[PDB]
Amino acid sequence: SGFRKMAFPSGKVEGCMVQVTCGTTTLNGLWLDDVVYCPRHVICTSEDMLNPNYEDLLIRKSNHNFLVQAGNVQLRVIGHSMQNCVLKLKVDTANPKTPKYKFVRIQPGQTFSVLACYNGSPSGVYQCAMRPNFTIKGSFLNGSCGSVGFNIDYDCVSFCYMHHMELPTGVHAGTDLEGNFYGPFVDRQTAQAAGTDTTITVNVLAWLYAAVINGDRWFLNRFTTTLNDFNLVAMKYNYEPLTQDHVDILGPLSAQTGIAVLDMCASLKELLQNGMNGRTILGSALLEDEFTPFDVVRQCSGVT
Amino acid sequence: SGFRKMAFPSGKVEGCMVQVTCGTTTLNGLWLDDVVYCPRHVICTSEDMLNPNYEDLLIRKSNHNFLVQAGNVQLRVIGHSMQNCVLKLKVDTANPKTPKYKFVRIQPGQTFSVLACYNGSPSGVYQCAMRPNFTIKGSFLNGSCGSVGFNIDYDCVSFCYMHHMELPTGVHAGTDLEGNFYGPFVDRQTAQAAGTDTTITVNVLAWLYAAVINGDRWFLNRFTTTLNDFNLVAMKYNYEPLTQDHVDILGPLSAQTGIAVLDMCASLKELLQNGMNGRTILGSALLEDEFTPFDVVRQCSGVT
Ligand SMILES: Cc1ccncc1NC(=O)CC(C)(C)c1ccccc1
Ligand SMILES: Cc1ccncc1NC(=O)CC(C)(C)c1ccccc1
Known part of the structure; x- marks a missing residue:
C-alpha cells in the first residue's frame, strides 16, 4: 500500500544521453543505434531565436561542427539532417547501450x-x-x-x-x-x-480508485450520477468531458473495488461542488490528474 | 523554471538489483562488489513472522539455500551472515555494474x-x-x-x-x-x-523559497517574526521547532531571493494560521515538506 x-x-x-554542441550552444541529445537526436535550435545563437530560418542556419553547418560527446568519448559525425524540429546526427558508432x-x-x-x-x-x-x-x-x-x-x-x-x-x-x-x-x-x-x-477527468477518477484501494474512503458517498449530469459539472469546473471510452478504461478499477464508475463520478461531483473541506486524499489537498487508469493498475499490482 | x-x-x-529466494520466500537484494544485501526476513515463513528467532532460523540455512539471481544469471553463494536485520550473502563474483x-x-x-x-x-x-x-x-x-x-x-x-x-x-x-x-x-x-x-519545518521553508524562485509569490507578506514567536506557531501546528542550524542551512536560499529567513517564517506563520484560502503553491494545495534546502538549490541550479 x-x-x-x-x-x-x-x-x-x-545510457542514451549525450551532449551536443554546435558553435556556442550546448544541449542534450539522445543516442539510439548510430543516430543522435536533439532539438534543432542547437544551431541557433541568441539573436537567431527571435525568427530563425532553420534551413538557412543548418546550411552553414557541416558534420564537424556538431560536437557529440558521450561522457568522455567523442562521437564522429558522418551525417546530419533536419526532420521537423529535430536534428538527426548520424554517428559512425552504434550506442552499445541502445535499449x-x-x-x-x-x-x-x-x-x-x-x-x-x-x-x-x-x-x-x-x-x-x-x-x-x-x-x-x-x-x-x-x-x-x-x-x-x-x-x-x-x-x-x-x-x-x-x-x-x-x-x-x-x-x-x-x-x-x-x-x-x-x-x-x-x-x-x-x-x-x-x-x-482542462483537468484530465479519467485520471482524477483513476486516482480516486487508487485512494479507495489504499484506504482513503472518506469521499465515497450514497449517490450516483449519469454521464450527462456529471459532464454538466465537468463543464462548470473545466474538467474534460467523460465518455464511454473513459468509463471502459476505468473498468478494471471498477471491477477491483466494486464501485461502479458512475458512483465514483458522483463522489467526484460532490468533491468538485464542495471541495475537500480541509481534508486530504493520498496526501494531496487537490484532485490529482497525472495518474492514468493504467498507471494506477500498474502501481497497485507491482508491474516491473 | x-x-x-x-x-x-x-x-x-x-545495475545492483538482484532477486533473493530462500525456501518459499522471494524478495530483492542489493549486489555491491561480491556481497548481496537483503532483509533477513527472507529466511522466514508466514508462521515464523509472528515471533521469529532469526538466529535459530538462519542456522537451518546453508549457502546453497539462498538463491540469488541477477536477471537471468545465477550467483554462487559462498558465505552468509546476519548483521542486525540484514543478511549479507557473499557471492563468488563481484558485480561488474557496482558503482x-x-x-x-x-x-x-x-x-x-x-x-x-x-x-x-x-x-x-x-x-x-x-x-x-x-x-x-x-x-x-x-x-x-x-x-x-x-x-x-x-x-x-x-x-x-x-x-x-x-x-x-x-x-x-x-x-x-x-x-x-x-x-x-x-x-x-x-x-x-x-x-x-511532525512536519519538517526547514523543508517547508525551503519549498517556500523554491516557490518564490519559480514565480509563486502570493503568500509573501509585510510581516516578520522571531524564532521564539514562530516556534510557538510551529508547536500549535505540529511543526518541528526551527533552530539557528535550520536558519543557517536556508542561508543560500535567503541570499538568492533576498527574503530574510524570519520574513519567510512570517509567511509560513500566516499560511499555518489562515490556510491557503483555496489557492495553490507550486501546484500543491498543502504545505510540502519533502524537499530539503539542498534539494531546492540542486533542482533550481541543475546539478547533475
Ligand atoms: C531557460 C529554459 C528553461 C527550460 N526550457 C528551455 C529553456 N530555454 C529556452 O526555451 C530558450 C531556447 C533558446 C532554447 C528557445 C527554444 C525555442 C523557442 C524559444 C527559445
Ligand atoms: C505487504 C507489504 C507491503 C510493503 N512492504 C512490506 C510488505 N509486507 C510485510 O511487511 C510482511 C513481512 C513478512 C515482509 C514482514 C516483515 C517485517 C515485519 C512483519 C512482516
Whole structure:
C-alpha cells in the first residue's frame, strides 16, 4: 500500500544521453543505434531565436561542427539532417547501450517520465502528464533542452517527448522524436498562446480508485450520477468531458473495488461542488490528474 | 523554471538489483562488489513472522539455500551472515555494474530516492523523506522488500535505506544498509507504534523559497517574526521547532531571493494560521515538506 507519483526507472534512458554542441550552444541529445537526436535550435545563437530560418542556419553547418560527446568519448559525425524540429546526427558508432525502443506520439492526458539532463548528464527523473493543451508542467532550466520523456513496457522504451522550450508562462513545450511539436508551438522566441487547459477527468477518477484501494474512503458517498449530469459539472469546473471510452478504461478499477464508475463520478461531483473541506486524499489537498487508469493498475499490482 | 518532486536517476542502482529466494520466500537484494544485501526476513515463513528467532532460523540455512539471481544469471553463494536485520550473502563474483558507493545513515527530515523492485526487477522510482518519526510514506507491495533508498553525489551512490515492512497503518519501515532499523521498529508481525509525526519545518521553508524562485509569490507578506514567536506557531501546528542550524542551512536560499529567513517564517506563520484560502503553491494545495534546502538549490541550479 501507499501511492506515489512514480517515474519509470531511468537506467535505459541514461545510457542514451549525450551532449551536443554546435558553435556556442550546448544541449542534450539522445543516442539510439548510430543516430543522435536533439532539438534543432542547437544551431541557433541568441539573436537567431527571435525568427530563425532553420534551413538557412543548418546550411552553414557541416558534420564537424556538431560536437557529440558521450561522457568522455567523442562521437564522429558522418551525417546530419533536419526532420521537423529535430536534428538527426548520424554517428559512425552504434550506442552499445541502445535499449529496445520505439518512437511514439502520446495523446494529451497520457503520462510519461522525464529524465532531466544538463550537458548530457542526468540530474533527475520525474513523472508528468501531457496536458490537454499539449504543454507539460515540468522542471527544466537552460541546458535541459534535448531531455526526453518516455514510458517503459518491460524491456522496450517508448520515447514520446523531447524538451525544446519554456513558454513565457513557465510551462514546457516540446516535440515527439520525429520533431513534431505537441500543440501549436513553434521553436521561435515569440509570445505563444498555450490553449485553455482542462483537468484530465479519467485520471482524477483513476486516482480516486487508487485512494479507495489504499484506504482513503472518506469521499465515497450514497449517490450516483449519469454521464450527462456529471459532464454538466465537468463543464462548470473545466474538467474534460467523460465518455464511454473513459468509463471502459476505468473498468478494471471498477471491477477491483466494486464501485461502479458512475458512483465514483458522483463522489467526484460532490468533491468538485464542495471541495475537500480541509481534508486530504493520498496526501494531496487537490484532485490529482497525472495518474492514468493504467498507471494506477500498474502501481497497485507491482508491474516491473 | 517549474518545480517537481524529482528522484535521482536510478541507473546506478538498477545495475545492483538482484532477486533473493530462500525456501518459499522471494524478495530483492542489493549486489555491491561480491556481497548481496537483503532483509533477513527472507529466511522466514508466514508462521515464523509472528515471533521469529532469526538466529535459530538462519542456522537451518546453508549457502546453497539462498538463491540469488541477477536477471537471468545465477550467483554462487559462498558465505552468509546476519548483521542486525540484514543478511549479507557473499557471492563468488563481484558485480561488474557496482558503482562508487557508501552506506550512510540519514537523519530524519532528509530526503532520498527509492527504486521500488519486485523479483529483482525495478518497477519505478520516487522521491521521499524519512519522516521525523522514522517511517517513510512510500509505495510498496508484497515482494518490494529489499528495495533501497539512496542519494547520488555525481558518481557516488549513498545507500541510506532498505525496505523491510509495512506497518498496520500503511506506512513503511526499514533499515540502513548495516541492518539497523530507522525508528523503534522490529522485523516482527506485531502491532508497532510509529511515533507522533511532525512536519519538517526547514523543508517547508525551503519549498517556500523554491516557490518564490519559480514565480509563486502570493503568500509573501509585510510581516516578520522571531524564532521564539514562530516556534510557538510551529508547536500549535505540529511543526518541528526551527533552530539557528535550520536558519543557517536556508542561508543560500535567503541570499538568492533576498527574503530574510524570519520574513519567510512570517509567511509560513500566516499560511499555518489562515490556510491557503483555496489557492495553490507550486501546484500543491498543502504545505510540502519533502524537499530539503539542498534539494531546492540542486533542482533550481541543475546539478547533475
Ligand atoms: C531557460 C529554459 C528553461 C527550460 N526550457 C528551455 C529553456 N530555454 C529556452 O526555451 C530558450 C531556447 C533558446 C532554447 C528557445 C527554444 C525555442 C523557442 C524559444 C527559445
Ligand atoms: C505487504 C507489504 C507491503 C510493503 N512492504 C512490506 C510488505 N509486507 C510485510 O511487511 C510482511 C513481512 C513478512 C515482509 C514482514 C516483515 C517485517 C515485519 C512483519 C512482516
